[PDB]
């Protein structure tokens, strides 16, 4: 086993080195607000590394985008909101707007960098 | 070129805890840097170089006592880690590796902590435990437009450490880009001359200082020789040094002469309470100028 | 579209007590509201928005110092609560909800007190402790048809808070209907253009502006472009603004253009003595108009 694989938005918790084989285990951590998916630990055996984990993306919610949807955050932290993978976010329609037909909720969940923005139409 | 003889005082022995040790380390490191690049060791006394080096080694060694297991730094081992200080250590060590033997693990470990712990998803860096010595952070002390200024400061540190750490820290290039993203998206709303200077150097380093942005950076200079704001004049020395380094990046050699002259006109020689950023920055830029003579 | 640059003076830091704080809060909230709706933060400058938001937080926060246990407001904690002030606070806060964090407890608690403590069984809202700054209430100062003018003003605040408060205040929809009942009952007996304009808008929101009532309202406009009475023009600016908002509620797009023309032709950008209501009302009406452009 040579050097452990790289993962996006993460890194091994230890100072890398070029000679491992075998039995060796390295651990990964993700960047702030990213969510580790898979076993934190990878191991060396038979020359190959066992599959490393991956870092599920958070979502960053901006007024810039929300404005296109005539929407705002319910618990008004900005303007800007970071939400981790798995966490739901609660919007309101902005003054003078209603949920709109093709939209089912003002509360949606972030998945690996994807969040549905509810549409609001205007009465 | 600031005459060697006017710099004898920048050679100091470092002391104190996690912040003060860096305050003393700074002048000596940047002084050896400037003297090397300007080739004034004859006018200064070559035999003095070795002694300065020993002082720098001493600074580096006692700084390691404030390295936390996470690889971050603070004034004291059990004070919450400072984003700013950790980046500042990266900035100094990343220069000092050329003067003395610095352990890559210490430097790149600080880099990985910054990246994996303190950068936000949109690329901004956040300070969660401000330094005690608010006088060592230069124009950042003015607390407003802080995301952009802190993000710029850290990004520059990261760019400084890139060639040294990219190997041990895979996430480095992506971190740099994402911070570049944030500075770019908001560079036009910048008001303070200080920020346009420091963010401008950060973007220029990447090649993202262009079009309207380039124009805005160039047209913030008063009299086309300095970047300044009302308030503490060290900030203006510092900011204008950032711009000099940015302009030097753009190869805009036809703009630098005034700026270089205004800086030399300041007759500023660094050192003293509150002089940390201005001292490091003034001598780094002019050093850069002297090696960039076409 | 009142040129953005011409609104710099509306960004003001709030100061003083229960009443004067609300007088400072007013130009700032409504200017930010207006620039949000007309999307003019580019002609005005996007970096100014964040500063203005801080000003709004300040006002809202220092206004809490004058909230009374009953959830109502007065200029001083020791002074009998004003019906009109409390209702105006609800109007301002309600319109700031997407701007800053407004505690539903403050908002709806004031709504509850208005209804359970200051509405009559017939529906009318009554002032038992008039504000000190009589210049901050615009056209309500003319003490004719007060029962109607006060009822409409308060009801309008209630309609503004309905969405957020209907859940926490069970009596709300009842109170709204009852006030409405009183309005249409005596609307035809109205003489003052101000009153027919502010009561008109109130009824129009519920759809209760119809038949002869709708007829009277429309025909009370002089030159079919303004609502007005002898006295200060500011009252007529305020009254024509309510009228305009009423027409929009009626989707009567055939009647508005002359109205919107007359207002713009008054060239009144807020500010000056006793400006509160004319400032809040004109910019609310003009913004609504831009949002409604088919």
DSSP at C17: S
Domain span at residue A34 reads: 8-57
**CA of B192: which chain C residue's CA is closest?**
C47
Q: Is A29 helix (H, G, I), strand (E, B) or coil?
A: strand
Q: Which two tokens stand for residue C60?
A: 């809202």
A78 and A48 together in one domain: no
Residues A35 and A70 in one domain: no
Neighbours of chain C (3+ CB pairs under 8 A): A, B
* A64 and A112 part of one domain: yes
Residues from chain B that touch C46, judged by Cβ atoms under 8 A, are 189
CATH code at position A65: 2.10.70.10
Contact criterion met (CB < 8 Å) for B117 and A6: no
Nearest CA in chain B to A80: B122
Chain B contact for C77 (CB, 8 A cutoff): no
Which helix (H) or strand (E) element contains residue A56? strand A54-56
Q: Are residues A27 and A46 in the same domain?
A: yes
Maximum C-alpha span of chain A: 67
Residue A12 sits in the same domain as residue A49:
yes
What's C11's DSSP letter? -
**Whether residues A119 and A67 fall in one domain:** yes
Confirm or reject contact between A8 and chain B (CB < 8 A). yes
| Interface contact B189, partner C, CB < 8 A | yes
**Domain assignment of residue A1, yes or no:** no
**What residue ranges define each of the domains in chain B, with the CATH number in brackets?**
1-294 (1.50.10.20)
CB pair distance less than 8 Å for A76 and C95: no
**Cα nearest neighbour of C94 on chain A:** A95
Residue A104 lies in a domain: yes
Strand A25-30 relative to strand A41-45: parallel, antiparallel, unpaired? antiparallel
Q: Write out chain C residues lying below 8 Å of B189, CB-based.
A: 46-47
Contacts of C210 (CB under 8 A, 6+ apart): none
Residue A2 falls within a domain, yes or no? Answer: no
Domain boundary among A57, A79, A95: A57
Nearest chain A CA: its distance from C28 CA (Å): 18
Residues from C in contact with A at Cβ < 8 Å = 95, 97-98, 100-102, 291
C-alpha–C-alpha distance, residues B288 and B225, integer Å: 17
Same domain, A80 and A105: yes
Nearest Cα residue in chain A from B120 = A32
Indicate whether A43 and A95 sit together in one domain. no
**Interchain CB distance below 8 Å, A32 and B171:** no
> Is residue A62, in this structure, part of any structural domain at all?
yes
> Which residues touch B109 (CB under 8 Å, ≥6 apart)?
A15, B71
* A68 close contact with C: CB closer than 8 A: no
- Cβ–Cβ of B174/A8 closer than 8 Å? yes
Q: Is A29 on the interface with B (CB under 8 A)?
A: yes
Give the dihedral sign, CA C79/C84/C90/C95.
negative
Q: Do A95 and C100 touch (CB under 8 A)?
A: no
The verdict on A15 and A68 lying in the same domain is no
Give the DSSP H or E segment for C155: helix C146-165
Q: Return the residue of B nearest to A85 by Cα.
A: B121
Angle B83-96/B104-113 helices, nearest 10 degrees?
Answer: 150
| Spatial separation of the C-alpha atoms in residues C109 and C106, rounded to whole Å | 5
CA angle B242, B244, B245 (to 5 degrees): 65
Count of beta carbons in the 10 Å neighbourhood of residue B293: 6
Q: How many Å apart are CA C82 and CA C178, to the nearest integer? A: 21
Chain C closest-CA separation from residue B5 CA (Å): 46
The verdict on residue A90 lying in a domain is yes
Please check whether residues A74 and A95 belong to one and the same domain. Answer: yes
Q: Is residue A3 part of a domain?
A: no
The answer to whether C101 contacts A75, with C-beta atoms less than 8 Å apart, is: yes
SS (H, E, C) chain B: CCCHHHHHHHCCCCCCCCCHHHHHHHHHHHHHHHHHHHCCHHHHCCHHHHHHHHHHHHHHHHHHHHECCCCCECCCCCCCCCHHHHHHHHHHHHHHCCCCCCCHHHHHHHHHHHHHHHECCCCCECCCCCCCCCCCCHHHCCCCCHHHHHHHHHHHHHHHCHHHHCCCCCCHHHHHHHHHHHHHHHCCCCCCHHHHHHHHHHHHHHCCCCHHHHHHHHCCCECCCECCCCCCHHHHHHHHHHHHHHHHHCCCCCCHHHHHHHHHHCCCCCCCCCCHHHHHHHHHHHHHHHHCCC
Q: What is the DSSP letter of C172?
A: H
Instruction: Give CA separation, A118 vs B46, B211, C41, in Å.
Output: 70, 36, 25
Does A112 reside within a domain?
Answer: yes
Q: Give me the long-range contacts of C50-55 (CB less than 8 A, separation at least 24).
A: C51/C11, C52/C11, C52/C28, C53/C99, C53/C100, C55/C11, C55/C12, C55/C13, C55/C14, C55/C28
For residues C238 and C149, give the distance between their C-alpha atoms in angstroms, rounded to a whole number: 13
- Closest-CA residue of C relative to A75 is C101
CA distance C46 to chain B (A): 7
Q: Cα–Cα distance between C294 and C253 in angstroms, integer?
A: 9
Question: How far off is chain A from B112, nearest CA to CA, in Å?
Answer: 8
A33 within a domain of the structure (yes/no): yes
Q: Is A33 on the interface with B (CB under 8 A)?
A: yes
CB A2 within 8 A of CB A27: no
CA-angle at B82, arms to B113 and B73, nearest 5° = 65
Chain B residue with minimum CA distance to C49: B189
Write out chain A residues lying below 8 Å of B181, CB-based.
none
- Spatial contact of B276 and B23, defined as CB atoms under 8 Å apart: yes
C-alpha to C-alpha distance for B95 and B75, rounded to whole angstroms: 21
DSSP reduced 3-state for A62: strand
Picking from A57, A76, A98, the residue at the C-terminal end of a domain is A57
Q: Are A65 and A112 members of one domain?
A: yes
Question: From B109, which residue of chain A is nearest by alpha-carbon distance?
Answer: A15
This structure was determined by X-ray
Which residue of chain C is at minimal alpha-carbon distance from A79? Answer: C99
CA distance C98 to chain A (A): 6
Smallest CA–CA separation between C239 and chain A, in Å?
A: 22
Residues of B within 8 A of A8 (CB-CB) are 171, 174
State the nearest Cα–Cα gap between B188 and chain C, in angstroms: 9
Mutation for testing the C interface, residue in A76, A79, A99 having most C CBs under 10 Å = A76
Closest to A95 (Cβ–Cβ): which among C98, C101, C102? C98
A64 touching C, CB under 8 A?
Answer: no
Could you tell me how far CA C115 lies from the centroid of its own chain?
18
**Taking CA B132 as the corner, what is the angle to CA B118 and CA B17, rounded to the nearest 5 degrees?**
95
Residue of B119, B120, B170 with shortest CB distance to A11: B170
Domain count, chain A: 2
Q: Which residues of B touch A (CB under 8 A)?
A: 105, 109, 112, 115-122, 167-171, 174
- Sequence-distant (≥ 6) Cβ neighbours of residue A69 within 8 angstroms: A117, A118, A119, A120
A17, A36, A57 - which closes a domain: A57
Cβ-Cβ contacts under 8 Å for A118 (sequence gap 6 or more): A69, A71, A91, A93, A99, A100, A103, A104, A105, A106, A108
Same domain, A40 and A63: no
Neighbours of chain B (3+ CB pairs under 8 A): A, C
Cβ pair C98:A96 closer than 8 A: no
**In this structure, are residues B233 and B242 in contact, taking their beta carbons and an 8 Å threshold?**
no
């Amino acid at each position: 086993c040579g050097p452990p694989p790289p993962i996006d938005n993460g890194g091994i918790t230890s100072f890398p080195l070029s000679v491992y084989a075998p039995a060796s285990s390295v651990e990964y951590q993700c960047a702030n607000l990213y969510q580790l998916e898979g076993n934190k630990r990878i191991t060396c055996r038979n020359g190959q590394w066992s599959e490393p984990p991956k870092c599920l993306h958070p979502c960053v919610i901006s007024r810039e985008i929300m404005e296109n949807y005539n929407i705002a955050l319910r618990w008004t932290a900005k303007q800007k909101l970071y939400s981790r993978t798995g966490e739901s976010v609660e919007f309101v329609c902005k003054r003078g707007y209603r949920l709109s037909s093709r939209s089912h909720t003002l509360r949606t969940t972030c998945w690996d960098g994807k969040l549905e923005y509810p549409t609001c139409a205007k009465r | 070129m600031l005459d060697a003889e006017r710099l004898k005082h920048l050679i100091v022995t470092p002391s104190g805890a996690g912040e003060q040790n860096m305050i003393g380390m700074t002048p000596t490191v940047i002084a050896v840097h400037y003297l090397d690049e300007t080739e004034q060791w004859e006018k200064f006394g070559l035999e003095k170089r070795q002694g300065a080096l020993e002082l720098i080694k001493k600074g580096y060694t006692q700084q390691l006592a404030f390295r936390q297991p996470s690889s971050a730094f603070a004034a004291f081992v059990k004070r919450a880690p400072s984003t700013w200080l950790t980046a500042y250590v990266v900035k100094v060590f990343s220069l000092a590796v050329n003067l003395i033997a610095i352990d890559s693990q210490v430097l790149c470990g600080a880099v990985k902590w910054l990246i994996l712990e303190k950068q936000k998803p949109d690329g901004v860096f956040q300070e969660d435990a401000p330094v005690i010595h608010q006088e060592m952070i230069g124009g950042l002390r003015n607390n407003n437009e802080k995301d952009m200024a802190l993000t710029a400061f850290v990004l520059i540190s990261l760019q400084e450490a890139k060639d040294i750490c990219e190997e041990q820290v895979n996430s480095l290039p992506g971190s740099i880009t994402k911070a570049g993203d944030f500075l770019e998206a908001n560079y036009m709303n910048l008001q303070r001359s200080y920020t346009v200077a420091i963010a401008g150097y950060a973007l220029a380093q990447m090649g993202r200082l262009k079009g309207p942005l380039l124009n805005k950076f160039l047209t913030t200079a008063k009299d086309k020789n300095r970047w300044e704001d009302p308030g503490k004049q060290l900030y203006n020395v510092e900011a204008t040094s950032y711009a000099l380094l940015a302009l030097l990046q753009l190869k805009d050699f036809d703009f630098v002469p005034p700026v270089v002259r205004w800086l030399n006109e300041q007759r500023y020689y660094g050192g003293g309470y509150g002089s940390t950023q201005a001292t490091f920055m003034v001598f780094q830029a002019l050093a850069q100028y002297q090696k960039d003579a076409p």
